[PDB]
Each structure stands twice: as structure tokens, then as C-alpha cells.
């Protein structure tokens, strides 16, 4: 039942960077850039340009309001989780 301890980690990760600066209730591309670069520094995604952030936000901020809600940010993990899983092939 790892999903049990892992879910607690995701709930803490939500407040760990979301309440770091700006509006803790919603995530702005600037705060999300820190989330992507602070949790995925060089493990798989390296952020150095706003273009990755801008393209990544259109993926979550499908509202175009330049903001990402907890539900929208949670989906980003799934996309990376799905891509990271691909790293494992048959071997």
C-alpha cells in the first residue's frame, strides 16, 4: 500500500512549493517553473527557458489564464509519470 505514504508525500509537495511565494491557493507559471525545476532539476526535465514552461502551462493551464490549479498541477505529475515509465522498456 505504498500509495498510502506516497499520497501523503504528494499532499505535502502541494504545499511545499505552492505556498512558497505568491498566491498559495493557485499556481502561476512562475511558481510552477520552480516546481518543475525544483522537483525535477536534472532528473529528467531541466528548465532554463520560459518556452518549456509556456508549453508546459498550455498542457495544464488549458484555461490560458496563466495559472494552474491543484487539480491542473496534479495532472503534470501524471504526464511525467507516464513519460518516466516509458523509460523502462521490455528489458
Amino acid at each position: 500500500s505504498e500509495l498510502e505514504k506516497a499520497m501523503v508525500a504528494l499532499i505535502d509537495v502541494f504545499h511545499q512549493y505552492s505556498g512558497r511565494e505568491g498566491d498559495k491557493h493557485k499556481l502561476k507559471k512562475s511558481e510552477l517553473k520552480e516546481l518543475i525545476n525544483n522537483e525535477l532539476s536534472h532528473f529528467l526535465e531541466e528548465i532554463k527557458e520560459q518556452e518549456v514552461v509556456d508549453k508546459v502551462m498550455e498542457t495544464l493551464d488549458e484555461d490560458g489564464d496563466g495559472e494552474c490549479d491543484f487539480q491542473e498541477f496534479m495532472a503534470f505529475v501524471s504526464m511525467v509519470t507516464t513519460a518516466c515509465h516509458e523509460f523502462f522498456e521490455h528489458e
Partner: peptide
């Protein structure tokens, strides 16, 4: 033996 996946594949 270390490699990185692809940011472009994830973007689209």
C-alpha cells in the same frame, strides 16, 4: 551509464 529521456516527447 546515464541518459535523459526527451522533453520534446513530453511537450507533444
Amino acid at each position: 551509464t546515464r541518459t535523459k529521456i526527451d522533453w520534446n516527447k513530453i511537450l507533444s
